[PDB]
Amino acid sequence: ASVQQQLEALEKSSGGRLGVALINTADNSQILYRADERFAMCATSKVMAAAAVLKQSESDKHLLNQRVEIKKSDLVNYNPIAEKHVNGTMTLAELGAAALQYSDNTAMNKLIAHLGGPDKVTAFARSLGDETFRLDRTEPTLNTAIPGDPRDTTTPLAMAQTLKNLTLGKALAETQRAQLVTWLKGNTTGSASIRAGLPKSWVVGDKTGSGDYGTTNDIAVIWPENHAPLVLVTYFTQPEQKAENRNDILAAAAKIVTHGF
């Protein structure tokens, strides 16, 4: 069974729709499975928002330390970091960190609001050459993940390309690229997703996402010990709105497509 057959087979079993894009930066080869199909990003979109703020910070040396007031009314449905700071401030950097490493939804909203709304995140993606990404909503509604809804979607390939540009490539100035990489490496939410499909000692940065329709996503940059990085997007979504998430599928997909390194 080739890698495509293995992915086909994984999807066939899975009860959903799998999207995979792996970029092997050794030779810019790719492993693609429904890679041009749209999927709801859910919190994987947070990478774009955080990166947009990093881009701004390249021309404003005070931005990352800018205070953002956190009010109880800013809290939404999943705020593990921001709730610790109500009535205080968090800096934009701290919001980036919380958004990326804990998937804090208030943090995401503060990034988006700082930037001037979801459309500003889209424009930032566009500025990186990503013609596919769109951010339409704030948290929490960007996670509705309704089948066929274009809002808050991208394709696996588009996101893989952009993630590579962001973390290893030309999108950000070097200190901000490194900051993004640091943030992704320090993610806390991805143990059971792509990381679980990889050799335990490979260094990985990732951002998960999850939403309704059992939408279960992860985007990762992977640094094998003896090989050039891999950039991997695994998106997964299911037909029924209250489907359980399926991080196991993402781990399985990651194992399939990284088997060689």
Side-chain angles (χ1 to χ4, degrees):
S2 77
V3 170
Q4 288 295 317
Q5 285 175 324
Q6 290 170 56
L7 289 177
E8 281 182 75
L10 176 62
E11 184 179 64
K12 180 172 102 96
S13 55
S14 66
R17 181 165 66 95
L18 179 62
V20 176
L22 183 138
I23 300 169
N24 178 353
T25 73
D27 56 7
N28 192 50
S29 67
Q30 298 174 345
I31 300 181
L32 303 183
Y33 189 85
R34 305 195 186 280
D36 290 315
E37 301 190 14
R38 283 187 179 278
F39 297 74
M41 289 180 284
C42 303
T44 67
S45 68
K46 296 181 184 180
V47 171
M48 200 69 71
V53 174
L54 289 174
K55 175 59 60 182
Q56 291 185 316
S57 76
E58 296 179 13
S59 63
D60 176 1
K61 70 184 190 176
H62 303 294
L63 186 63
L64 290 178
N65 285 331
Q66 180 175 327
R67 290 175 167 185
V68 180
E69 294 284 336
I70 310 304
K71 316 270 171 201
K72 184 176 194 197
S73 72
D74 292 324
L75 301 180
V76 288
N77 64 325
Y78 187 75
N79 326 296
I81 308 306
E83 70 175 0
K84 296 170 181 322
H85 304 280
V86 169
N87 303 136
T89 58
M90 293 173 68
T91 64
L92 283 169
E94 285 164 356
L95 291 160
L100 294 187
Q101 299 186 327
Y102 295 92
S103 213
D104 190 295
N105 282 347
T106 294
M108 170 61 149
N109 282 351
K110 295 295 206 186
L111 298 171
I112 295 169
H114 168 74
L115 291 165
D119 61 304
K120 310 303 193 289
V121 185
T122 304
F124 174 67
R126 288 290 179 270
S127 83
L128 304 187
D130 190 320
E131 73 202 86
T132 305
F133 175 100
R134 51 185 289 177
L135 198 68
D136 293 275
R137 287 171 298 165
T138 66
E139 296 287 358
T141 62
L142 68 82
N143 307 289
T144 52
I146 298 155
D149 187 345
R151 292 177 294 173
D152 310 296
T153 60
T154 196
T155 64
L157 175 61
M159 188 61 108
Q161 294 169 328
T162 301
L163 187 61
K164 177 179 160 275
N165 282 329
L166 282 170
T167 58
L168 296 163
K170 62 197 174 4
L172 295 175
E174 172 61 35
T175 297
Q176 280 75 3
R177 174 184 334 140
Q179 179 64 81
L180 179 61
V181 164
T182 296
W183 279 339
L184 293 168
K185 285 180 173 181
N187 182 33
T188 72
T189 66
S191 183
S193 310
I194 287 169
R195 286 163 190 268
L198 306 177
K200 282 164 194 177
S201 67
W202 281 4
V203 170
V204 177
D206 81 298
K207 179 74 193 81
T208 50
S210 58
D212 293 345
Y213 293 87
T215 298
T216 313
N217 295 336
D218 198 18
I219 72 176
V221 186
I222 299 160
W223 287 265
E225 176 57 28
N226 301 303
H227 288 96
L230 312 173
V231 179
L232 176 58
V233 172
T234 55
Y235 280 172
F236 182 71
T237 193
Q238 293 171 77
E240 65 289 32
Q241 181 177 50
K242 288 190 187 331
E244 65 171 338
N245 302 283
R246 300 289 308 280
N247 279 286
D248 60 308
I249 294 295
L250 306 190
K255 185 181 192 179
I256 287 164
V257 301
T258 64
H259 181 254
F261 316 78

